[PDB]
Every structure is written in C-alpha cells, then in structure tokens.
Enzyme design. Structure first.
Site, PDB file in Angstrom:
ATOM      1  N   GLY A   1       0.802  -1.200   0.000  1.00 42.81           N
ATOM      2  CA  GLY A   1       0.000   0.000   0.000  1.00 42.81           C
ATOM      3  C   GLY A   1       0.840   1.258   0.000  1.00 42.81           C
ATOM      4  O   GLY A   1       1.995   1.279  -0.431  1.00 42.81           O
ATOM      5  N   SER A   2       0.248   2.317   0.494  1.00 40.48           N
ATOM      6  CA  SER A   2       0.806   3.645   0.508  1.00 40.48           C
ATOM      7  C   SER A   2       2.223   3.677   1.083  1.00 40.48           C
ATOM      8  O   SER A   2       2.885   4.681   0.861  1.00 40.48           O
ATOM      9  CB  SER A   2      -0.259   4.592   1.054  1.00 40.48           C
ATOM     10  OG  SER A   2      -1.578   4.092   0.819  1.00 40.48           O
ATOM     11  N   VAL A   3       2.720   2.660   1.792  1.00 36.66           N
ATOM     12  CA  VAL A   3       4.029   2.770   2.436  1.00 36.66           C
ATOM     13  C   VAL A   3       5.172   2.641   1.445  1.00 36.66           C
ATOM     14  O   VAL A   3       6.338   2.824   1.828  1.00 36.66           O
ATOM     15  CB  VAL A   3       4.263   1.712   3.534  1.00 36.66           C
ATOM     16  CG1 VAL A   3       3.026   1.518   4.392  1.00 36.66           C
ATOM     17  CG2 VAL A   3       4.662   0.422   2.904  1.00 36.66           C
TER      18      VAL A   3
END
Ligand SMILES: [Zn+2]
Length: 558
Positions: free
Chosen positions: A273-275
């Site tokens: 995800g966003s990480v």
C-alpha cells in the site's frame, strides 16, 4: 575384543533472550516403571493394585485407573523388562520421595528430559518447537540418530546444528558374559546455548496488545539489524508440540480464520500500500522532470486512456508536492509521477531497498512476495505491461506483495541510509566459550535525496493532518512514520463456511500498515505493525504509540 565404545548424545542447548531469560529449557524429571507379570501370573493377584494406590496417594495428579490399563496391555510373557507407566514426573515433585521409590524393588525410576518452553505462547514463531527425528534428518545429522529430538520450526529448526552439540564417546571393557567391568576412556558430549536479540518483556507486551487481534509486529535496531521483538499473531502454545498434536489439535489448527499456525512475519505477504511511496518517491527524484517541490493537482482522481484511477480522498487533495503527497498519502501524485518516470525506474529502485527479496533473516523459509515488473508480468501472466499497472504499482497495490519483515528492512534502510539485515541471533554462549558473532543499496544521488523523504515521514507523524498525527505527535521520542492500507479482494467459499454471518464484515475490512522509526534525530529503532483487518479492539497507530511508550519505560532510549 572386549573393549567397546558407545556414543553419548548431549543435552540439547538452551535458548535465552537478550537479557538472559530462559526461553527453551530441558525440564528434568523421571519415568516410573512397574515390575512385570503382575497381571499375567496368578501368583501375584492384586499386586499392581496395591503399589498403585500408594502411588496415587503420593502424586494424585496421576490417575490409577488409566495407569493400570496401559499396564496390562504391555504385560506379556514375551516381555521381561519393566513396564514403563508414567512418562514424566517433575524432579522437584519426586526428589523428596526418591529413596522410598529407589529402595522399592517393584518401582524402577529412570531420569528423563522434557523440552519445555517456559513462556508457552509468547514468541512461538521465533523460538519454535522440537519434534521426533526425521527419516532424512538422520542422513544429514548423526547426532539426531542418538537423540530423536530435532528442531522442527523457528530458531529450533534454523539453528538445529548448533543446538545439537557434538556427541561424546565412552570406552569400557566387557568380559565373557558381556558386563560393565572397567571404563577405559571417555570424552563427554558438549552442547551450546544461544541467546536471541528479543526481550521477553517486550515480546509479552506485543502479545497482550494484540490479544484478540491478528497480524504482525517487529521492533528492530536500525544500525545492526538486531530484532528486539517480533511477533506474528495470534501465537500458539509451543509445549503441546513436543508431546505431540491431538486429532482435535489439528482441526482448530486447520479450521481457524486467524491462521495462528503461520508465521505472518516472513510467511505472510500483503500489499504494501501507501508505504511504498517513500521508495517510489525516491525513484522519481532523479528525473529532472520531478523535483522535491514539483506539484501535481489531485482532484480526487485522474483519467487515463478512458479509465479512472481514484485517490482515497474522493474530495481531492489539491495541489501537492512530494512532501505533502507523502504526508497525506495522496495516490494521485504518484499516478502522475509514475507516468513521468515509467515502471522500469520504479521497479529497479524498489528492488534495491528490498522488495521481492529475502530480508536475510535467520528463520527458515523466508518468503519473497511479489515486486511487479514488466519481466515479471510476462512469465506469470503471458501479457504485456499497461500504464494501468504502473499506476497500481506506484501506490503499492495491484499485485505488489510484501512481508512484514520486508517493510521493516525497507523502513530501517530509509532511516539508516544503508544496508540493514534483520537477525535474531545475539550470541552463542556454548558452555565455557560464548562466541557471539558490505553492499551499498542507495546510489550516491539517491542518498542526497533521502533527507526529503525523511522530512515527509516526520510530517506524517508530527504535522497536523499527517495520516498518523493523531497518535505519534505527542510521544517522548520524536517519531517518523508512513501509513498503508491493503484491501481484500475476495472471500473464499470455504472461509465463509468456517465463520458465522455476523463476522463476514470484519473478514473483508482492509488491512492496516504503520511503519515508523525513532528518534527522528538519531534513528535507532523501527516499529512495523500490521493489523489484520484494522484490528478488533486495537488500531494501528494506537498500537505503535503504546509499543513506543513501553520501550521508553524500559529505557531502550536512555
Ligand atoms: Zn490525493
């Protein structure tokens, strides 16, 4: 001749935590055995009933009913040894009554060693359990021939050769009736103890934070890789595995939608995800077309070749530069950026900070996950690569799959600026000798651009409206962070059968990442938490806030 030599296998080594506390021991105890023929010969009527009633009176945890039952099944004319009945009685519960059993010539007591993990469930995925020796493990290690205990998971499995020890040899003289007449020579077996980096006090706290929830956690030093704590959740009690699993134990191991039997840390993989944006953002900056302060406008989506890619913020983020695109986790910035940059550039950069690659950790069978690439798609799917894919990949979704351990390696490397390999092995403290016991991963330019990335990470956690500001902005250690989310696409027809209708909701709620590092000034630790389905009674940030608060209470920042 009449000189003969036998091999003695050693006591399998003990496993301790960073400050000495004992995680795997050999419990000392005794087996009680009964003289034979007491049910087969009419002479000795009522004889086993007698000596058992004296026994049951002495240790009432023993049940005279079943005990005389297992007896008469073994009492035969074809056999003339003693009939083992009690497998194991703890030394401390017996040594008061020793002389009375030894001098009793109807009970024969022998010493036995039981592998016992004193912390049960705590750390079950790291420590591991032992088991009966394998048909091919006897081909590899001859010390398991003589022992029949060998490591079957965890450290126990990984470091089995070190925990076996070398054998010992004893020479003696027999005679013409084959008897122990004289001992000649004798080199004793030796065994080694190992010390892990984990801290059982911190390992416990993770377990009770996560009690009732599922997921993964890792607290790791950024300088040398020493894992100060690490859990997959929920954990299982190790000790029932030494004795053997039940018919019923297997079911609740195979029909359980929290999958406690699986090391989510390195055998569970999930969409980053966003990480990944820190890493994807790093791949942007060497373009001349993207810069730290280049802006892209986020109207809650973009359109590409007729298809729409959304931001998570339906009402749009506005103009953002990289710093604020990270701070707010704007997907749209990386959509536009990636289009500029191309997939080859994102993939190459993403693979060096450790995606789709073993972190190097010392647990057996680490999984690599999936770092997508044109080359990858071509073999796995026999399909060319479409800008759509670049877009999904740019914000850590699509087929992008990572293991919690990988996130932690990656976070750590962003904070250190260099290679960081996770390890549990602190020291080998082999009796009378404690023995203990590099490739650049950022380009010379990429290292110059890392301060921008780290400032964005600080924003995520201390500037108003950072995705993690609510919880990390008032800690006694200044923390940097990045949030992530992975949604679940499917719900198997089986998994539905294994749960009740009410709980279907939960089992499809997207997953929560929060990876962090502290102190922002002189980074020392990484805290990577993954709550399966956003948790049932914890939340991602609150968990990390508490994990940091406990580490301060234990002086790990003093
Ligand atoms: Zn946005």
């Amino acid at each position: 001749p009449a000189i003969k030599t036998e091999f003695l296998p050693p006591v399998r080594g003990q496993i301790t935590d960073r400050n000495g506390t004992l995680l795997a021991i050999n419990d000392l105890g005794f087996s009680i055995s009964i003289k034979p023929y007491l049910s087969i010969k009419k002479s000795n009527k009522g004889i086993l009933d007698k000596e058992l009633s004296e026994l049951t009176n002495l240790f009432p945890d023993l049940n005279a009913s079943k005990l005389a039952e297992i007896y008469k099944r073994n009492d035969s004319y074809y056999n003339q040894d003693f009939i083992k009945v009690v497998d194991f009685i703890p030394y401390d519960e017996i040594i008061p009554h020793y002389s009375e059993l030894n001098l009793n010539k109807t009970i024969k007591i022998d010493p036995v060693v039981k592998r016992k993990y004193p912390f049960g469930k705590l750390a079950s995925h790291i420590i591991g359990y032992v088991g009966k020796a394998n048909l091919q493990d006897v081909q590899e290690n001859e010390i398991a021939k003589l022992s029949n205990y060998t490591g079957k998971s965890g450290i126990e499995r990984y470091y089995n050769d070190i925990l076996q020890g070398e054998k010992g040899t004893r020479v003696y003289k027999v005679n013409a009736l084959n008897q122990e007449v004289e001992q000649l020579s004798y080199t004793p077996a030796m065994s080694n103890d190992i010390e892990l980096t984990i801290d059982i006090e911190l390992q416990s706290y993770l377990t009770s934070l996560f009690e009732g929830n599922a997921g993964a956690a890792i607290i790791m030093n950024v300088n040398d890789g020493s894992i100060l704590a690490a859990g997959s959740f929920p954990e299982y009690d190790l000790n029932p595995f030494v004795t053997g699993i039940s018919f019923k134990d297997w079911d609740e191991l195979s029909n359980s939608l929290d999958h406690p039997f699986t090391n989510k840390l390195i055998n569970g993989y999930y969409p980053p995800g966003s990480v990944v944006k820190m890493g994807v953002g790093l791949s942007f900056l060497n373009s001349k077309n993207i810069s730290p302060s280049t802006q892209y406008v986020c109207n809650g989506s973009i359109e590409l070749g007729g298809r729409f890619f959304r931001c998570w913020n339906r009402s749009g983020h506005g103009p953002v530069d990289l710093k604020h695109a990270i701070k707010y986790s704007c997907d749209v910035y990386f959509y536009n950026g990636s289009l500029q940059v191309g997939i080859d550039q994102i993939s190459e950069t993403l693979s060096r900070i450790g995606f789709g690659a073993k972190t190097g950790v010392d647990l057996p069978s680490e999984f690599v996950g999936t770092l997508p690439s044109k080359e990858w798609k071509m073999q796995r799917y026999r399909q060319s690569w479409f800008q759509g894919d670049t877009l999904n990949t740019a914000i850590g979704q699509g087929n992008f799959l990572a293991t919690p351990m990988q996130i932690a390696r990656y976070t750590a490397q962003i904070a250190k600026g260099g290679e960081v390999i996770p390890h549990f092995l602190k020291s080998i403290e082999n009796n009378n000798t404690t023995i203990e016991n590099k490739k650049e991963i950022f380009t010379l330019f990429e290292k110059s651009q890392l301060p921008y990335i780290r400032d964005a990470m600080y924003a995520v956690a201390n500037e108003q409206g950072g995705t993690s500001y609510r919880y990390l902005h008032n800690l006694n250690v200044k923390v940097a962070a990045k949030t992530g989310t992975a949604q679940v696409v499917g719900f198997s027809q089986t998994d539905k059968n294994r749960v009740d209708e009410k709980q279907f909701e939960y089992y499809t709620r997207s997953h929560a990442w929060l990876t962090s590092y502290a102190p922002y000034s002189k980074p020392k630790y990484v805290v990577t938490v993954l709550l399966e389905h956003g948790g049932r009674n914890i939340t991602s940030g609150a968990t990390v806030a508490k994990i940091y608060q406990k580490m301060i209470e234990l002086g790990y920042f003093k």
